[PDB]
Design a protein around this nucleic acid. Structure first.
Ligand SMILES: [Mn+2]
Ligand SMILES: [Mn+2]
Ligand SMILES: [Mn+2]
Ligand SMILES: [Mn+2]
Lengths: 745, 745
DNA sequence: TGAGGTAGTAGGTTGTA
DNA sequence: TACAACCTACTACCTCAT
DNA sequence: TGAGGTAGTAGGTTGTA
DNA sequence: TACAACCTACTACCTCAT
């Protein structure tokens, strides 16, 4: 089979126990808590003594050479205590930080073209390289004509074991930056009203957008009684305004919104935010060109990290610590156990389907009882386009036809829909006010001959005249009518395509229509392990200080949705309260007992993120009820990438490819081709349970492949994935009694 | 008529412009913001210089005598600038703080019984008196045998006009305190496991409850490596542990829960929280005895504040400023305009009702269409008690009978209910687990012959075996069946009463049953002013970091509920977002157009609290739609009390009694007899609108008197009152389409 | 919002304590 | 205050080919 | 949770900036 | 950090008397 490896390079030779200088931080201020100042004391002693290595154990600072005890800090009186050779066996993380410091100090001395520094070193795990290794294996500055920089952004994490052997865990991202601030764009004369920007002279994390450009110069005394240059000199920041010339004083004052009031900054201090949108708006050719540079398959990630490690080389102050430029041939050397999980068997109306598109030839597994009467909203200037769109949808669903012809790929009577262009209604709506959208949706429910809406909304782009998706879905949630919304662009694809491109649009639209009416296209034939129901718990954070409700979804062992429970009250944080856990799991056991006749003997709880809930509550709750339960932490955001090494040839791994060490597991659930990036695996760890992680990973990978809303699988299992979809459609939850209908899909 | 006055005493003579010493606070720390340290600098310069008057203007400190510039503070370098006689016309608040300082300094020198200080002065607006003026006009220490103190808690607010004349606005509350800490209760030997306590050695505001009492002494070195006395000496707080004796070192360590982890305090530092519950549990006779001392009618409040002002007397450092000991005979001298608002005319089935209890003789105004089938849950050991309870409810509602006899006060066929003890179901439920409560409610909806539930729940007290209200109301909200819950004690009142006491129980239960099925008992005959709909906006805060959704209720001009809108997403703060305002008021105009055929020409928005929303949004939204709108800020919590002075005789004001100065208005909406306290008026101000405040106050007082869930009126208007009731029943909102049924009631 | 993925940009929450 | 793991939101790009 | 009020205890959020 | 107006939660007490 294909071996699996991670982005890791083995260190040649070990590190020795070396002399450290233990320092003490005490709470010199009005407080006495040193834990709230330990990292600040580390950073100030590192920065105030020409960037020399300072490390952190629980209350102490450790240093590789003799530095004077600093009383100059007002918050931290760092003082020498003793001189101790720390052993490797008790100080793994400290020697990991030592190795990453010496990697940083070795890479600071590396140059490109003999003049330019290659790496931007701040002596951290994060390393920005000013140049990029290209696909043709050449270090090149990726700049544009408009000053946009692309920088390869490395993240090192060396791990030292008890013997001193070092394993350099690596990853690489991209970094969008620019050297042109707003002063240079005003010297050039660019439209800067409304740009999302950041201030390089403050560390405050907040959305900064430009209101306008005032004609007042920065040297003129402002509305606060003093000028802005005087305002920067009074803030003990006169060194930033010291190098300003007379032409710099002729800069126009650019006021900037800081989400509470109008801030007043100078245009030299503010730098624009280089998103994909800004980069595409200003220089679209450069944003085309870096598409193969930011979306890196595992071979080009290996070549990038190989060039990085060749730039590291030998480290003469760690007993000649050099790193290999090859990945491990297997992760068994790293403790992981690798493999591939077998594909789920998906059942249809005619039996096993080999692909998800064969469900439109075989027919869906469960059609809901009853006839589905359509209704259609569409904007008024898009009439015949919407005619052709609903014509294509109905010919796909009922009459089994694509482009008017009966197709071998499509079965007749996929969904028992009822749409007659004489009988069914086409209510057109004028684009415009939001209350007119809401009244148009209420007007379409004025006629009781509509059981499902195929409303055509404008594009999610085109920031002009308001989108009707949000008012339509809110009103149809208030009215408990399901609805599949469609952009104007998708309707124009249905009107204007002659190839089979719109067929896949039709596949996903009809799977949406089916899931929203309680139908099921495919089911699992058999789930691995002894499980009765799946619960996917999640708490999402919409904004600052706003949390989504602790959404749960309930599945059976075959992965069809029994239930979802949105608690009506929000909570304080990402931990679910035991009262909310009471609500959720009483709803779980009630729904499983309603559809099955008894309590579930086995529950697997897929907690999205960390299972920070009280485990003693869970043990009491399911031990009083004779329920064996399992808590699996399914985690989305993880910088770890899995490769497939095959006689030294790095490639993207297939879906179902996992690595497993202990309870932590990284599993690839997406099959992503080269020149489209590399697959982001799911970090999966078991916080509680007694099922082995092979069963848990097989169940999670089975739950990824049974996403009933698309013909291609979800990256997340639909426990945590449908919890995310309900957190997205949280203002769109239908009013009436909770059932199998998947509104969020 | 009866004059209205406020708790205010006029000052005899004026204050002169006096010499101030303007000081400067600069941001000496790593920050430069002086507004975040101005009050701390005021307090430290006040405390570090033997409690001398320090005042705050926007960035400056003002002082009445020459104090040295203090550089000892690490955060504030307070420095003298200039010496200026501030004029009265520009510095109203500063001279108000001067007068309140000199009142504090005059009252510090006042003694009771020649030995004991009367007042506890911290030189603020708040003044605790150690003694109480009793009802018999005698200064007496209100102590108990268990160390519980009652203290009269004054709040002064002198107001100086431009001429220097001073008006002492006053109020008085009570203060529950004790002198016995947990060290003295352990020396006495009291049960202290589980007590809600506070630490007198920290200013952190949080719930502190005792987990247990450890046998470890406080002198023994703890689990942190150091003892607790060493922990207080290391925190620069060795003066608190300096006076401890050997018997103090034999105190047991009392660990205390601080909502995140176990804190470890000594029992001398922790003081128990003296609530009404703790006071009633320990010394119930003293809590009986102070009922007429904390709930003070306006005459006893006048006598208390009169004794307070007689203790103030003449102030020789404010040009002999003495205060009167009489209220104003009218608030026209204070700028207010007083009066009484006419009573609302309540219409019934037979016409105008003079009292709300005549609606049970005349019949209700609107019965809903259809027959209402009861269903009853009750706990199993309370069977015949629940038989008699539902017997009394059905004899009141349908057969018009009280205690089995046809009553002249009760009309036959009040509500078209259907309850046959042979046909209707009595599902009994075992008290116990919450999931058994939820399954009992689902079992009562297993039979489809129930349209309303009269479920009998256990008491809200009796912290033993779990209350079933919350699971029942959650499940019946999931099932869209309305339900009137009843305690076991109320059912025992229906079973065991022979007088007309349970008749009022029956009145409020049947008004609840009527409002929850969409019926309306009474309506307004005519509303004052040109208004089409009332909107009551509110955002509630359940806990720290948790906000209730921005609930709105919609009324017509006659005060019957058109609509309520709970947004599905929570928000960050008490300001309603303009997207949420879009949702709310589109729902408002849609509901008024659905029940009336057009948009409302006039809207009055009763915002509970502050109308902190964007007024430009409102003006744009209702100006594009040709709607004149009004925003009234109806405010619950206000220390201001209105009196009725009648030839110098102070008494409680009637309901509908208002005072009005400008846009701010205080209106008494509750008719509260003497020896039951004094009425808390509603602070009401118009943030936007063009209706006069007499119309706004008449509409608010009309909206108080049409609370359809009780035979006695609500203090709040049912705009803000029903917004509060939906915020309380926020996890109890029924699933199906929003209608006239008042679930929250 | 056809669906799903990769990618950056930005902002959080919590635990480490 | 501060990073490490986790999140969320938004936007490009890219593809979909029994 | 019959309903409503007054009362304390406690904890917030925001604006003042 | 800090008070001033506003809130919320909880608990006692008290009453209800056409
Ligand atoms: Mn989520
Ligand atoms: Mn969808
Ligand atoms: Mn409220
Ligand atoms: Mn009620």
């Amino acid at each position: 089979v294909s071996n699996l490896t991670v982005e890791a390079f083995e260190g040649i030779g070990s590190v020795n126990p070396m002399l450290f200088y233990q320092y003490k931080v005490t709470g010199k201020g009005k407080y006495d808590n040193v834990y709230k100042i330990i990292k600040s004391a580390r950073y100030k002693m590192h920065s105030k003594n020409r960037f020399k290595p300072v490390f952190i154990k629980d209350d102490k600072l450790y240093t590789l050479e003799k530095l004077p005890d600093i009383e100059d800090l007002d918050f931290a009186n760092i003082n020498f205590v003793k001189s101790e050779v720390l052993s490797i066996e008790d100080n793994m993380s400290i020697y990991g930080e030592v190795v990453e410091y010496y990697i940083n100090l070795k890479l600071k001395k590396v140059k490109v073209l003999g003049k330019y520094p290659k790496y931007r070193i701040n002596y951290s795990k994060e390393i920005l390289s000013n140049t990029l290794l290209t696909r043709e294996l050449k270090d090149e500055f990726k700049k544009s004509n408009k000053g946009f920089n692309l920088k390869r952004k490395f993240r090192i994490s060396p791990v030292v074991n008890k013997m001193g052997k070092v394993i350099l865990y690596l990853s690489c991202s991209a970094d969008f930056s620019t050297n042109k601030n707003i002063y240079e764009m005003l010297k050039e004369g660019l439209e800067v009203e409304g740009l999302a920007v950041k201030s390089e002279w403050s560390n405050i994390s907040g959305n900064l957008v430009i209101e306008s450009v005032l004609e007042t110069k920065i040297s003129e005394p402002t509305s606060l009684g003093q000028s802005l240059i005087d305002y920067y000199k009074n803030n003990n920041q006169g060194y930033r305004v010291k190098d300003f010339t007379d032409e710099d004083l002729n800069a126009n004052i650019v006021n900037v919104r800081g989400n509470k009031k109008i801030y007043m900054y100078i245009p030299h201090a503010l730098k624009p935010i280089i998103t994909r949108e800004y980069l595409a708006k200003n220089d679209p050719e450069f944003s085309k060109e870096i598409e193969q540079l930011i979306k890196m398959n595992m071979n080009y990630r290996y070549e990038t990290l190989k060039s990085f490690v060749n730039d590291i080389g030998v480290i003469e102050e760690l007993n000649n610590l050099s790193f290999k430029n090859k990945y491990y041939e297997d992760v068994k050397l790293l403790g992981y156990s690798s493999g591939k999980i077998d594909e789920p068997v998906l059942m249809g109306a005619k039996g096993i389907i080999k692909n998800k598109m064969q469900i439109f030839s075989n027919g869906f597994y469960k059609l809901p009882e009853g006839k589905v009467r359509f209704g259609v909203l569409y904007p008024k200037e898009f009439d015949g386009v919407s005619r052709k769109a609903i014509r294509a949808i109905y010919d796909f669903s009922k009459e089994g036809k694509y482009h008017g012809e009966s197709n071998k790929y499509i079965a007749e009577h996929l969904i028992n829909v009822e749409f007659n262009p004489k009988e069914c209604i086409f209510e057109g709506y004028e684009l415009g006010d939001i209350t007119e959208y809401k009244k148009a949706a209420l007007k379409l429910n004025n006629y009781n001959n509509v059981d499902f809406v195929i409303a055509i909304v404008p594009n999610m782009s085109d920031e002009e005249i308001e989108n009707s998706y949000n008012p339509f879905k809110k009103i149809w949630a208030e009215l408990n009518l399901p609805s599949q919304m469609i952009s104007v662009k998708t309707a124009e694809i249905f009107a204007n395509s002659r190839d089979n491109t719109a067929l896949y649009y039709l596949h996903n639209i009809v799977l949406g229509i089916l899931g929203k009416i309680g139908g099921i296209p495919w089911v699992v034939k058999d789930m691995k392990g002894d499980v009765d129901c799946f619960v996917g718990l999640d708490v999402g954070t919409r904004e600052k200080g706003i949390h989504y409700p602790a959404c749960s979804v309930v599945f059976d062992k075959y992965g069809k949705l029994i239930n979802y429970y949105k608690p009506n009250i929000p909570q304080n944080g990402e931990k679910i309260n035991t009262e909310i856990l009471q609500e959720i799991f009483d709803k779980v056991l009630i729904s499983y007992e309603e559809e099955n006749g008894a309590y579930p003997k086995n529950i697997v709880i897929h907690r999205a993120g960390f299972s920070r809930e009280d485990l003693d509550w869970y043990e009491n709750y399911f031990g009083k009820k004779n329920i064996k339960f399992n808590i699996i932490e399914v985690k989305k955001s993880t910088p770890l990438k899995i490769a497939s090494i095959n006689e030294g040839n790095i490639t993207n791994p297939e879906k179902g490819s996992y690595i497993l060490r202990g309870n932590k597991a990284y599993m690839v659930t997406t099959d992503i081709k080269e020149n489209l990036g590399s697959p982001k695996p799911l970090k999966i760890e078991k916080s509680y349970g007694d099922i082995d992680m092979l069963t848990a990973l097989s169940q999670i990978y089975a739950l990824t492949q049974i996403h009933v809303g698309a013909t291609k699988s979800l990256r997340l299992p639909i426990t945590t994935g449908y919890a995310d979809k309900i957190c997205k459609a949280i203002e769109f939850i239908p009013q009436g009694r909770v059932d199998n209908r998947l509104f969020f899909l």
